[PDB]
Amino acid sequence: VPLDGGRFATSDLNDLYRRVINRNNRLKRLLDLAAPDIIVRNEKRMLQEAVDALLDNGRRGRAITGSNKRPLKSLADMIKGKQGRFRQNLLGKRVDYSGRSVITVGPYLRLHQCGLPKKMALELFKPFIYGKLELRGLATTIKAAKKMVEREEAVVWDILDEVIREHPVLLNRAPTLHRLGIQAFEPVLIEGKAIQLHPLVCAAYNADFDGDQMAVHVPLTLEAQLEARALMMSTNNILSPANGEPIIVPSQDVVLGLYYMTRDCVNAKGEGMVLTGPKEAERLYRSGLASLHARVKVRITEYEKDANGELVAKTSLKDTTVGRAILWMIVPKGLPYSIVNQALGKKAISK
Amino acid sequence: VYSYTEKKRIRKDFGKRPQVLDVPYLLSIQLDSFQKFIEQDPEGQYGLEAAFRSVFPIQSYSGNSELQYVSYRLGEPVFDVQECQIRGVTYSAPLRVKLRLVIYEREAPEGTVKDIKEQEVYMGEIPLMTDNGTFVINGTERVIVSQLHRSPGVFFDSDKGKTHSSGKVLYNARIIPYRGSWLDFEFDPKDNLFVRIDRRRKLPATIILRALNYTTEQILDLFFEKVIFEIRDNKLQMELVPERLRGETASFDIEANGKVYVEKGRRITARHIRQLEKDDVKLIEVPVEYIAGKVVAKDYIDESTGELICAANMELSLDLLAKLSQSGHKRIETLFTNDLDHGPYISETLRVDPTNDRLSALVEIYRMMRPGEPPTREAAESLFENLFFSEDRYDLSAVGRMKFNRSLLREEIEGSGILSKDDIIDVMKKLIDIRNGKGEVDDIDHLGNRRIRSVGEMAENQFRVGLVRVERAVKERLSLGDLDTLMPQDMINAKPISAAVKEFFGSSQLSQFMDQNNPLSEITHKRRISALGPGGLTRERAGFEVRDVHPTHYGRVCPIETPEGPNIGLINSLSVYAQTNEYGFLETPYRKVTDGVVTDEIHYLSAIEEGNYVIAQANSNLDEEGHFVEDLVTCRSKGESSLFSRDQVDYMDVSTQQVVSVGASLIPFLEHDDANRALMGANMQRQAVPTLRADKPLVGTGMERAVAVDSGVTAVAKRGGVVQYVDASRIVIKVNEDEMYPGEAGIDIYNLTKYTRSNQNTCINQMPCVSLGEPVERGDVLADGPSTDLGELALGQNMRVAFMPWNGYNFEDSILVSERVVQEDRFTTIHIQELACVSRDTKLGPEEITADIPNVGEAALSKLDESGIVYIGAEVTGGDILVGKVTPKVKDSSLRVPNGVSGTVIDVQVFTRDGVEKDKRALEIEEMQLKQAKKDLSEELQILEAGLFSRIRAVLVAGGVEAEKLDKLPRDRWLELGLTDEEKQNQLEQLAEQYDELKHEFEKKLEAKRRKITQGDDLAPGVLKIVKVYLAVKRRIQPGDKMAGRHGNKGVISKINPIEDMPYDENGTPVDIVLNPLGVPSRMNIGQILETHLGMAAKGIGDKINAMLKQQQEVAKLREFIQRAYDLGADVRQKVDLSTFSDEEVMRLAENLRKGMPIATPVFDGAKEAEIKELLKLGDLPTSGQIRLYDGRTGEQFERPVTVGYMYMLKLNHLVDDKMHARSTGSYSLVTQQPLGGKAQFGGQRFGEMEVWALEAYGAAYTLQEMLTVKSDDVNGRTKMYKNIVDGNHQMEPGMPESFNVLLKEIRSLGINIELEDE
Amino acid sequence: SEAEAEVAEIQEQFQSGLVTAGERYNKVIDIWAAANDRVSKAMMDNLQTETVINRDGQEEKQVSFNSIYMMADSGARGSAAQIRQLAGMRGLMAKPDGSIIETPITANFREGLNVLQYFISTHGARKGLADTALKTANSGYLTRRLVDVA
Amino acid sequence: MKTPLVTREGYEKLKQELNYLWREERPEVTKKVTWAASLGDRSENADYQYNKKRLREIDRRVRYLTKCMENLKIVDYSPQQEGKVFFGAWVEIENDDGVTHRFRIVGYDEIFGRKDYISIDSPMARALLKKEVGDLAVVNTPAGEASWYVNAIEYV
DNA sequence: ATTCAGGCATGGCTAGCTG
DNA sequence: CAGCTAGCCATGCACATCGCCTGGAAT
RNA sequence: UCAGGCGAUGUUU
């Protein structure tokens, strides 16, 4: 490789081969004069040590050095070590079609989608954009196409919305330990310049928001898209393969939330009354005539599938807390009621 | 009393402990060391004198001629710091050497035939140190780190346990000199005393023992003691000192005076020894059993035979007894041995010895040192006489000598640089004695054995290496002398010296690139103590216990400042009050203690001396008279800590600050935080980016004034006086009367430093801080620097903040920030990048810098000139063209802005290699710089003359005034007139000659500066012209950055809400930042909450004053109110009183207060809760420190009132746009057709091994295939892939990878045959 | 106060001649540990249920609304241990030798700290960090070996 | 340095304390650590840190007590032979000046001030391995020698 | 303008000493 | 002639990133 | 465009 200046970056194999060839030519010249044999012995010894150097510099005695102080690299090192070919260019290769950025939170997302920044996208899916362009017939060749996508005119952004709509992507974090370490998502375009990522996964990634970095990846072929959707989309991982406990455990604020939302004092506003339904419960709490927690008798109705896989209802007058009734409007059809009639710490919500 | 320029903004102060030793000059290490390096000094003693007087004189091979030294002298640089930073040369200096050559006659006394003295021969160049303690090599600003390594001397170590798994510890001893080879001693489980020279194979130490020309008899005499037997006609009876029966059990009955005293086979008390010594008898008979175990000392020979009768170091037997008896030998020498007292280790070693004499021993050592070499008498002689006894390859230090005698209980502390037989013998004695049981090992980590070098010392060593190489050369050449015709320039060639010193200051494990982006960052990078470097250990191949703190780091090394990660403990920062002892240990101050008073006399102490005394902790309640209010007190004695008595202590702490570093003393309320977070806090604070408007942090620690004033970015004055002229460029100070020198009296001029470049791409700027007509006192601020203000150190800004979760957006640590911040531009930062285009001259054609370019429209071309370089001020964007460069074939190679940055073009530089035509633009810039320099120096002369004429006038008024005759003739020449016969006339003549000298000086400097600028300076060979262009981006703030506290809570700003939605308060104000409460109990740093409260109090006082001032009142109200605000507490130091502030300064004081009443807090003596409460009560906020709020969206009330207050926050330089990155299809590496790595090189990410494991874990396969085949390796693969993508058909075609093909080739390179096979 | 009185009694007994060196050592360390536990229980009772109010009758206690106790009992962050190191004394501190030091840290992060105490806590933290590093190394190596055999 | 001699009552008490630590104390801190681990950060967290510290401290205690219980020589000897002062005996001693003391002599693990709190390795006991009622006995304190006299003895 | 001087843990192996 | 056996070498030591710097002496 | 040095940011008792 040529350097900046009238010099050249010295390699190692070059120096080694050159040494061997010098020594060989000298010996060849020596076998014409029939010099005394001690000389040719010293010669052969030099040559043997040199070929030794070329094949493995560092296995005989003191290894030959190079420019400054260090053993120049030989073929044995080309293959060995943490920096030979195996562990550096055949088990993990750098890869095109990617990018990286900083993460933030953005809690307005459903957990099967994640943010992404416009500029990153328009740099990623350049081929797709080219294609849809000359399909809709806006530029003859690829030239005007690339000129348009650099100038960043109007229609490109609409085109990009049309091509991202259902095209999953992969997110990666650096110390990948267990196979959660790579999950999938669908993009939703954002402004700014930093990936937005759902909260309920920052436990599986083991990734706080203190300035970490995440990498993107874009599948190209069609089998690949279907792989990423049917196997690695985030919805299909709610259990660590280590052990059957859930991994979508709500983490650290949401828990304080639910906690303060369900508890009981002994005496607050609106204590000692009766409510026809969780609906008017929430209505009270919004209007501001009843405290957020005060024990109350209310009516609730619950479902149970005790039949041959069939749902059956039953209703009654439970004794509970107003906030707890408000929480009730989210439980789906099939659970019992006692699951949400206590403190709701962390273990509780987990089970 | 107070300085006049402190009265501007007097900083309220809590704290109790009266301080007695003000903070010293924070840059002692660097400057004192280097000054010591280079300065004229007699009698050698650590300068260039040292190196020279060591190497010279240089004598021929008795060639009757010899070279010697006289005196050295420097000159003065051709350039100076500013020009140098611009151009790229080193800030260097000439070096001249006066040498003397002399010649003697052949066959005569030392009669000088002839001598000559070359006129100060040139040699080499050495860099100087800028007044701020930084070096300047190549347009950059490097720094050298003080190094911490093991002291020269002797050492005794255990290496307990692990070895040999036998439970029996070992003991080894090492000698490490300052320049030479090593030397060791150690035992083995078989109890034998072995030696090794320089980590090589092992030997029995007797080899070198007798290599010192000793006989076995002498060796035994040295080590062991004597026991005698003589011919008393039967068993050849004995005499014995009863002391030799110390705690023993006799194997034979002890009889004397016909009286038995102890039973045969019992232990013996000391009363027995007492009574028998009182008896005073030694003649005793012995049995034969007690005999055989002994060993002969000397060798007996007989009259007739004289043959091998007895060999020294041999045991006994009755036959030997009979043999020596029948030969008639009176005396019998033996060896007093034991098991718990005297192990006969030397005798065992001797029995293991294979050697016989000095000759064979030298042979053996010569053979083990260099394998495969012919043993030879002179060879071994001259070898072993050159590893422990000659100046050539071995030398300790004075320091080495001091330690080496100290650890041997010697008497004096000055000797030779070499070893001695006596010394080695004594070392081995000490080791044996340690094995016996008395004495103790000495651990390494104790700072009495580490040592701190510095720039001066290391420079001296390298320069010495240079001198010895040049003397090799000089000796070589001088071996071929001539007839008097050569002169001392052929006898010298400095190129090796230059090579050595350049190599050191340029490329070495210590000289490194200065982190210059924040004043604090500088001043804590210069004071860095590193354990790495040539002469020290390594990063991960180094020990463990050195990475640990030791109970003697106290006050000499920070506990809590070090980068985490791959190298902790190795990069200890240096303490605050630490100094450098004469020999080079770490010494700290203390206060002397008399009988019952804490006297006010300081006293410096070293490491080892500390161990013997007893030392009193700082925060101890004294009472005004040195009396400790208790009679017991917490103190430390020897790595201990325990309550002691009253009349025992002898030294007390100086202040309380002395257990931290400047890097971590700015942390208010430090003591309430853990260790971990204090650490991360100091480190983050070090990375603060400057701002565009600094604002005096509220909760400070009083250690700001020094940290700023002395870190020489702000411009300190030198002679107090009256400000005469102000302007963003320069400041012009008139001097007072009596702080003046008689000649060249004049006035001082300060050239500030306008917008220019850092080394981390930040904007180093300066701003005036005074106005016309304003007195200034010596040693005071005049120019604020980057992130400074009014002198004090400021890093970020102070903002109103409230702790409460708020709709998720602060989920984990995500700070939230309201637009009220991004409007006022109170985090806007300024960055500057620097782009370079070059003009090579390659065969097939030289390059071009024209404007005309093929295949580009008028769009890009319009911004360019008619010459090819962008105007000074265009607002270029990403992709545009700054310089037009083309390569003939003609191809475009113009210079374009890297994609992403906006900005503006603030400045352009042009360099041209001499011998080439110039363009139009370079000529124009030349004329510009000429004109400016001329005007500048003309103004210099004009204002200086103005001051001098003013002084003349002021003088003529005294002693011969002519008020009317003075202004008759103009300012032209007021010396036309005369003065009486007085020294005032002498003074007039002084002034006149100074005026004429200034005339001539202006002339010469003008001409010289013109000549400097005119020429085309040198360059790297093979180049024609370089163009450099600057840019100035203005990055504001946007979701993704990293703002931080100081206590150590990080965060990534995440949304910018509109003004409305921030939770407001009942009085109406919004709030600006909303952190996450759950972060506080987790990271146990309770501090930031107290910081918040105290800040709330501050701003309370502030707003109160602002109201009182806006409703303009009589000043007396302000007087009283500020008075109260300043008293407010228990006994303190401050004791200000505004009864003496001239009734006008008060107003200006209120002016600078209306933003807050800055409170200070020393580190371990800070404000307590009660005083915080009472300050708040002086305000009007509620005592609880919590307020109710009102959420903006719902417009209703939160519950359970929350916390608000001002929490000074910082910004780090991990901005988002230096991390966002993406690649689709770019370059490709050359060897293995793979995509490149990094960002600057427009490459892509890395798909790691563990990730391949993950994808295998899922069933996904096609993803992995095209992840490491189509997107990386197969050339045909990705071409096909691209062509198919452009038309909808999503489908790959794998093919074979290529890196694998390379693997095949490189294995085939060897004798191997690897192949593919049949299909 | 009572703890100090006890160590004074033990010191008197030592210089009176009824114990040995390590004997005094262990005696002292045990009684400090016991005091530590008493303090912990004291603070926990003084917080968890401290709220006592009227009911429209006279009084009845209930679980509290102290913010820190909520942030702990929920399971969000921190627990009895951390609230200890914020309220009660922060126990004992080993030294690099491993020999546990013979004077507890009678302070706590809310009140201040005199120098020595903070210094010793530094000992602890630094050793912790170094072990983090080396342990990481070995863990990675183990994972790699396992995946290359299965 | 040590003596495996221990009394059977303290032996039982110590075994019971061992069982207590290993059954009803370990698992709770265990659950706490298993809980805290599920949090994200580990270097930015302290709850895991200090709970782990608790585990280390309890483990050290159980290790020590285990080795002890391995190496405990028990002598549950009766008052069968009496007349001297050798072990496991109540002892009154008085000064020639008025200072009095009552104590029982036991092994190393039984010293916590409650009932019988003196270890044999102490110089006091070392000067009393066998004596007769009404006799002088001296010891060597760090402040010099001392003296007392026996009053009475009752084994059990 | 060509040219010749601070690690640890482990395993594997080889002289070298007792029956 | 065999069973250790202590002493001497080979080989091993997480992942990801960013910025700056420097690449033969003599003839 | 390759190799080394240095420093720094993350996960990490």
Ligand SMILES: [Mg+2]
């Ligand atoms: Mg993190």
